[PDB]
Amino acid sequence: SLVCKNALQDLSFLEHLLQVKYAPKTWKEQYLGWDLVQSSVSAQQKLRTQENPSTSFCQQVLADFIGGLNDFHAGVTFFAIESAYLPYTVQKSSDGRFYFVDIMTFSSEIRVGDELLEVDGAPVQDVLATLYGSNHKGTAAEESAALRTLFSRMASLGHKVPSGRTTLKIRRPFGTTREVRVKWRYVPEGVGDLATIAPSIRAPQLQGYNIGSTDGFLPVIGPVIWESEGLFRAYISSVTDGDGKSHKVGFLRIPTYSWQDMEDFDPSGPPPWEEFAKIIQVFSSNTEALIIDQTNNPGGSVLYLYALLSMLTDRPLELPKHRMILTQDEVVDALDWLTLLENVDTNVESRLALGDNMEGYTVDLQVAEYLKSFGRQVLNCWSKGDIELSTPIPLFGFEKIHPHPRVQYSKPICVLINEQDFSCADFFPVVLKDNDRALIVGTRTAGAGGFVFNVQFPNRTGIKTCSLTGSLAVREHGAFIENIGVEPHIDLPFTANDIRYKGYSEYLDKVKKLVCQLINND
Amino acid sequence: SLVCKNALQDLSFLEHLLQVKYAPKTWKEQYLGWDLVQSSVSAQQKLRTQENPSTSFCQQVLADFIGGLNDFHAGVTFFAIESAYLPYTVQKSSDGRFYFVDIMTFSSEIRVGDELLEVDGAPVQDVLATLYGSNHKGTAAEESAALRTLFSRMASLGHKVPSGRTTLKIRRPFGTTREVRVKWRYVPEGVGDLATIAPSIRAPQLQGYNIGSTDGFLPVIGPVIWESEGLFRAYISSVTDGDGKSHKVGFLRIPTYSWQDMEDFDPSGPPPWEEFAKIIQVFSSNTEALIIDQTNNPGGSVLYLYALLSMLTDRPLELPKHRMILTQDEVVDALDWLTLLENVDTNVESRLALGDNMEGYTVDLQVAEYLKSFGRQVLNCWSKGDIELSTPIPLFGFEKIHPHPRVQYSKPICVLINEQDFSCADFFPVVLKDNDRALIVGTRTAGAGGFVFNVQFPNRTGIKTCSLTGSLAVREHGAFIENIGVEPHIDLPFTANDIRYKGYSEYLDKVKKLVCQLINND
């Protein structure tokens, strides 16, 4: 089959990429027991045993292949518009129950607070399992990612896309069970399937709960005495400990690290790191502690991550490093750095070459020194042959974060994290935890440790982008971040009660106690 | 050998790319007698047959492989910085002699006008031959392209970079012949040769005359009575025909079609197409004819090219079409135009969606209909399997160039072209000549007629980018532009007298004579 031959040829290329620039390969083989060849043959078998397989089929098989790496940064997108979604958002309680927390439509028999029991006569947990990847380990993170695709399928991601209607068995809060008939919002495929066209081909002739949400879903922690009216959701409340003694506590939500994609961001007005700074000043002056909600964050720019970290300390913070796979491509970046900073010996000279700030991070002679150090280390590894999985190297050469020159929050911090924190959102709590700067609370993060790089190549299988991880992050003490993530100091999952009434009062009550203990420092 | 295995693996990927998205393949096989598998096997031999090869050696072989396509748009750049340069510019006359026309250095032994006889003891011609591509066809375009690298060698382009002193043998205008010792401005390689690193690579272990010159190199054809002071070089001169009768003739130079790269261009200010409109309004009033200097133009933005062409006609012009190779990547681009203009149904909406214009080309409902038609034509081809080399299709669906609404030049035009006009500089004369709007004078254009795409992929051979041609432009009469380019009406090459005495008097006298015959409308 033409379609089949194309998929096998492209499968071998993706297989090849994994052997050239996939830094976590060795980790996956040892941690998951993953085997490139077997996994590859397992996919070839699915392609070869179909029957006039469709382009869609092949895309689905290739996505599962890359899906077997159990890597959030490793995936495959296709040139396919087909999709189907249901205007519902659910959240799972620590005791295994799924509740609707948001409905985006008309008074359907499904309301917020109802519990989801089945999908097409099958228990929700069993339907989710069919959405897991080949090497599913059972982490909360993989579970949640699967949940997110329960009501949002896209051919561009390799999902099977359903159409028509489906049955959801829901449970009302007063015990009434009802089977509800819902209809997928379906967008038909626009790219014609290559198999249908194959026989007619002629030889050439001449002549919110969303990840990244600004506000998040947590209700205020107590009476508000102050509130920011800018980009970020931030405010001051008064919490009374178990001794009727009031305390002023700051609350701030860091929604994403790709600052330009922030809801309501205006490229003409002042950058987001400047408004963040205005909020910290207020907090430094009028608060005794700071709660930072970092849940449901996709990550984004590292330099921005560093920018925010630099305003939450008055002492340098040690940073993790990355084991990299080097090619002459990285070597040229190294040389570019060294020449750009060649004649830099003063703070003024640093800014003249790098700018006043790098996405919020203050530029100094120290920044220029780190970057030069970075280029020298890349060049040294290259000449030493340490290029398959390099000695750990810090991004941009930054060994540590130095306190911002003007604003520095120095009181106790309590960061809230969850299974939907990836990339920089993994790093934020890692840095604060390992440097003992803050109390980490919530549930283990996703474990997406390594920078991504995308690869595009012409093909007739519909592959648009294959993204891969080019590094393996390692913490001060040796622990890898990939797949493990960051464990919180206090495991605090959401209960059925927190979710069922959308009050999260048991979660917030817990958070308030911890903070009070931080203040009273007992 | 590791560097060799890698080059063979990467060569095989380049070979594959040519079997998937290289539109002029069929044309190269029949017009050039080129054979993929044959050239490939030849490259493999050079690699294997080499005694412990270096990275740059392999890069040279892969560049020679791609150069065998004899396509100005097909090339390979490498992550390498080594390079050598000599501060001289040379121009070849029709009789086959090379005279210096520019010296970017101190008053050395070489002067403008001197004739270049040899380089490194070998005659100039033989030195150029070492630079020709596998399937060199003797065209002037190919020989000028090689001449451009005589004094500029870059490893980033796969050239062998020389260094040290060399000998240029020249001849003074009065007969004296001298051997001049010179030194290459040499930049050594900064990206370590992988072959030198191979033995120690450890296994992964866990934890003017330039193309695009604004002014060009032609001196005014007569006394300047008027002169523009904008970005372009334009003026009005009074050419007294054979009978002393003075005629006011304008002169305009179109340096490039990538307006953003123009000399002194300023984004924060009025666009080049607006200044072009200003200049034309002036010629419509104060000239009886117009000479367009379009030599040494690298091409650029198609829309911008249509913009300028719409301001030089009062009647519509037929446009060439393209035979494209299609993958779902292109099908998606097509669908995107269709959704973007899904609700466009009036002139006003057309501009709300596209802007008052697209790089100078007047936006109208017709324009939008053209774009939707383009998306529909691509979809139809896909559904028919006409994807290896589709039936001809106009870029953006633009069947014809519609005259600019505010400014149009009605009087006769003379366009000067040469072998260093590529891409859009091929189309400009092709459109005017096919629609009988202008007199084309000079020498055949390069013949680079197809759109390009760039491919990147991780590798240890140091390949940065590989550009390929994804389309074959076809003229109304059925002739291809690729390799053939466009032939002028009057063949007027630059004679030795034109070059040596840097006056192009023989040339400009012929141009002036040809003009007056047009103003006399005989």
PDB file of C-alpha atoms in Angstrom, chain A residues 9-10 13 16-17 20-21 26-27 30 55 79-81 190-194 197 200-207 323 325-329 331-332 335 379 382-389 453 455-463 472 478-480, chain B residues 9-10 13 16-17 20-21 26-27 30 55 79-81 190-194 197 200-207 323 325-329 331-332 335 379 382-389 453 455-462 472 474 478-480:
ATOM      1  CA  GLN A   9       9.518   5.263   5.644  1.00  0.00           C
ATOM      2  CA  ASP A  10       8.579   8.155   7.944  1.00  0.00           C
ATOM      3  CA  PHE A  13      13.036   8.720  10.128  1.00  0.00           C
ATOM      4  CA  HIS A  16      16.454   7.988  13.419  1.00  0.00           C
ATOM      5  CA  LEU A  17      15.795  11.334  15.137  1.00  0.00           C
ATOM      6  CA  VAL A  20      20.518  11.547  17.065  1.00  0.00           C
ATOM      7  CA  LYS A  21      19.023  14.298  19.232  1.00  0.00           C
ATOM      8  CA  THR A  26      19.318   6.394  27.940  1.00  0.00           C
ATOM      9  CA  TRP A  27      17.058   7.461  30.809  1.00  0.00           C
ATOM     10  CA  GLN A  30      16.654   2.328  32.076  1.00  0.00           C
ATOM     11  CA  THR A  55      -3.649   8.299   6.401  1.00  0.00           C
ATOM     12  CA  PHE A  79      -1.569  18.494   9.062  1.00  0.00           C
ATOM     13  CA  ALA A  80      -5.166  17.400   9.760  1.00  0.00           C
ATOM     14  CA  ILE A  81      -8.140  19.567  10.754  1.00  0.00           C
ATOM     15  CA  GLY A 190     -10.389  18.849   5.298  1.00  0.00           C
ATOM     16  CA  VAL A 191      -7.250  17.079   4.091  1.00  0.00           C
ATOM     17  CA  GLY A 192      -8.312  14.251   1.790  1.00  0.00           C
ATOM     18  CA  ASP A 193      -7.077  10.813   2.800  1.00  0.00           C
ATOM     19  CA  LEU A 194      -4.174   9.703   0.624  1.00  0.00           C
ATOM     20  CA  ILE A 197      -6.493   9.157  -3.984  1.00  0.00           C
ATOM     21  CA  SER A 200      -5.432   7.804  -9.360  1.00  0.00           C
ATOM     22  CA  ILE A 201      -1.926   9.270  -8.881  1.00  0.00           C
ATOM     23  CA  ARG A 202      -0.089   9.871 -12.175  1.00  0.00           C
ATOM     24  CA  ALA A 203       3.661   9.978 -12.791  1.00  0.00           C
ATOM     25  CA  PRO A 204       4.958  13.508 -13.453  1.00  0.00           C
ATOM     26  CA  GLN A 205       4.730  14.597 -17.099  1.00  0.00           C
ATOM     27  CA  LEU A 206       6.370  17.660 -18.665  1.00  0.00           C
ATOM     28  CA  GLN A 207       5.066  20.713 -20.585  1.00  0.00           C
ATOM     29  CA  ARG A 323      22.974  16.977  30.233  1.00  0.00           C
ATOM     30  CA  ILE A 325      23.459  16.109  23.097  1.00  0.00           C
ATOM     31  CA  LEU A 326      25.736  18.360  21.040  1.00  0.00           C
ATOM     32  CA  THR A 327      25.952  18.858  17.261  1.00  0.00           C
ATOM     33  CA  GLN A 328      27.842  21.616  15.431  1.00  0.00           C
ATOM     34  CA  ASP A 329      24.564  23.562  15.637  1.00  0.00           C
ATOM     35  CA  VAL A 331      28.716  24.853  18.808  1.00  0.00           C
ATOM     36  CA  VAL A 332      27.880  27.789  16.527  1.00  0.00           C
ATOM     37  CA  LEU A 335      30.779  30.885  19.235  1.00  0.00           C
ATOM     38  CA  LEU A 379      33.278  24.323  23.082  1.00  0.00           C
ATOM     39  CA  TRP A 382      32.841  19.438  21.835  1.00  0.00           C
ATOM     40  CA  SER A 383      36.642  19.085  21.608  1.00  0.00           C
ATOM     41  CA  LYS A 384      36.624  16.455  24.382  1.00  0.00           C
ATOM     42  CA  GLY A 385      34.062  14.325  22.573  1.00  0.00           C
ATOM     43  CA  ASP A 386      31.628  14.559  25.507  1.00  0.00           C
ATOM     44  CA  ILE A 387      28.831  15.099  22.998  1.00  0.00           C
ATOM     45  CA  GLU A 388      26.447  12.153  23.341  1.00  0.00           C
ATOM     46  CA  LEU A 389      25.077  13.172  26.755  1.00  0.00           C
ATOM     47  CA  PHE A 453      13.355  21.382  19.647  1.00  0.00           C
ATOM     48  CA  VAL A 455      11.719  19.110  13.474  1.00  0.00           C
ATOM     49  CA  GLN A 456       9.824  19.564  10.211  1.00  0.00           C
ATOM     50  CA  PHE A 457      10.418  17.564   7.040  1.00  0.00           C
ATOM     51  CA  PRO A 458       8.507  17.044   3.792  1.00  0.00           C
ATOM     52  CA  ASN A 459       6.398  13.883   3.684  1.00  0.00           C
ATOM     53  CA  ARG A 460       3.096  12.438   2.502  1.00  0.00           C
ATOM     54  CA  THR A 461       2.046  10.965   5.831  1.00  0.00           C
ATOM     55  CA  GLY A 462       0.832  14.353   7.021  1.00  0.00           C
ATOM     56  CA  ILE A 463       3.504  14.907   9.681  1.00  0.00           C
ATOM     57  CA  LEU A 472      18.020  15.946  30.580  1.00  0.00           C
ATOM     58  CA  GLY A 478      21.838  14.325  41.239  1.00  0.00           C
ATOM     59  CA  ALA A 479      18.134  13.564  40.774  1.00  0.00           C
ATOM     60  CA  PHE A 480      16.750  13.826  37.237  1.00  0.00           C
TER      61      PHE A 480
ATOM     62  CA  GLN B   9      23.457   8.759   6.249  1.00  0.00           C
ATOM     63  CA  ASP B  10      22.881  12.476   5.701  1.00  0.00           C
ATOM     64  CA  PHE B  13      18.370  11.914   3.558  1.00  0.00           C
ATOM     65  CA  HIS B  16      15.206  11.210  -0.238  1.00  0.00           C
ATOM     66  CA  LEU B  17      14.198  14.890  -0.021  1.00  0.00           C
ATOM     67  CA  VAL B  20       9.540  13.904  -2.259  1.00  0.00           C
ATOM     68  CA  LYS B  21       9.403  17.707  -2.625  1.00  0.00           C
ATOM     69  CA  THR B  26      11.490  15.450 -14.012  1.00  0.00           C
ATOM     70  CA  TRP B  27      12.769  18.570 -15.757  1.00  0.00           C
ATOM     71  CA  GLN B  30      15.285  15.387 -19.299  1.00  0.00           C
ATOM     72  CA  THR B  55      33.995  17.186   8.239  1.00  0.00           C
ATOM     73  CA  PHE B  79      27.254  25.373  10.420  1.00  0.00           C
ATOM     74  CA  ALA B  80      30.808  26.432   9.603  1.00  0.00           C
ATOM     75  CA  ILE B  81      32.515  29.815   9.818  1.00  0.00           C
ATOM     76  CA  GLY B 190      35.823  27.662  14.887  1.00  0.00           C
ATOM     77  CA  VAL B 191      33.688  24.503  14.756  1.00  0.00           C
ATOM     78  CA  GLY B 192      36.009  21.614  15.551  1.00  0.00           C
ATOM     79  CA  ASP B 193      36.459  18.909  12.946  1.00  0.00           C
ATOM     80  CA  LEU B 194      34.511  15.885  14.153  1.00  0.00           C
ATOM     81  CA  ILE B 197      37.131  14.207  17.971  1.00  0.00           C
ATOM     82  CA  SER B 200      37.468  10.026  21.926  1.00  0.00           C
ATOM     83  CA  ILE B 201      33.674  10.263  21.711  1.00  0.00           C
ATOM     84  CA  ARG B 202      32.328   8.547  24.812  1.00  0.00           C
ATOM     85  CA  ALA B 203      29.140   6.521  25.070  1.00  0.00           C
ATOM     86  CA  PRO B 204      26.242   8.088  27.023  1.00  0.00           C
ATOM     87  CA  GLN B 205      26.430   7.424  30.786  1.00  0.00           C
ATOM     88  CA  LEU B 206      23.746   8.367  33.335  1.00  0.00           C
ATOM     89  CA  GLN B 207      24.160  10.850  36.242  1.00  0.00           C
ATOM     90  CA  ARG B 323       3.256  23.217 -11.580  1.00  0.00           C
ATOM     91  CA  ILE B 325       4.405  19.175  -5.917  1.00  0.00           C
ATOM     92  CA  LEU B 326       1.773  18.726  -3.220  1.00  0.00           C
ATOM     93  CA  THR B 327       1.808  17.233   0.310  1.00  0.00           C
ATOM     94  CA  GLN B 328      -0.863  17.857   2.970  1.00  0.00           C
ATOM     95  CA  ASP B 329       1.324  20.770   4.114  1.00  0.00           C
ATOM     96  CA  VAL B 331      -3.370  21.337   1.324  1.00  0.00           C
ATOM     97  CA  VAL B 332      -3.471  22.927   4.765  1.00  0.00           C
ATOM     98  CA  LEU B 335      -7.611  25.442   3.633  1.00  0.00           C
ATOM     99  CA  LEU B 379      -7.819  21.063  -3.147  1.00  0.00           C
ATOM    100  CA  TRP B 382      -5.187  16.868  -4.327  1.00  0.00           C
ATOM    101  CA  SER B 383      -8.490  15.050  -4.772  1.00  0.00           C
ATOM    102  CA  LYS B 384      -7.504  14.055  -8.339  1.00  0.00           C
ATOM    103  CA  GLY B 385      -4.080  12.714  -7.403  1.00  0.00           C
ATOM    104  CA  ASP B 386      -2.432  15.447  -9.481  1.00  0.00           C
ATOM    105  CA  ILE B 387       0.149  15.958  -6.779  1.00  0.00           C
ATOM    106  CA  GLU B 388       3.451  14.863  -8.301  1.00  0.00           C
ATOM    107  CA  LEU B 389       3.494  17.809 -10.707  1.00  0.00           C
ATOM    108  CA  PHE B 453      11.234  25.845   0.912  1.00  0.00           C
ATOM    109  CA  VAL B 455      14.548  21.955   5.349  1.00  0.00           C
ATOM    110  CA  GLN B 456      16.494  21.579   8.608  1.00  0.00           C
ATOM    111  CA  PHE B 457      17.240  18.437  10.613  1.00  0.00           C
ATOM    112  CA  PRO B 458      19.568  17.386  13.436  1.00  0.00           C
ATOM    113  CA  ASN B 459      22.818  15.823  12.232  1.00  0.00           C
ATOM    114  CA  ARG B 460      26.497  15.569  12.992  1.00  0.00           C
ATOM    115  CA  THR B 461      27.666  16.444   9.471  1.00  0.00           C
ATOM    116  CA  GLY B 462      26.933  20.073  10.268  1.00  0.00           C
ATOM    117  CA  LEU B 472       8.024  24.786 -11.875  1.00  0.00           C
ATOM    118  CA  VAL B 474       5.348  27.890 -16.802  1.00  0.00           C
ATOM    119  CA  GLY B 478       4.191  26.712 -22.457  1.00  0.00           C
ATOM    120  CA  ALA B 479       7.890  27.405 -21.910  1.00  0.00           C
ATOM    121  CA  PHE B 480       9.582  26.761 -18.625  1.00  0.00           C
TER     122      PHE B 480
END
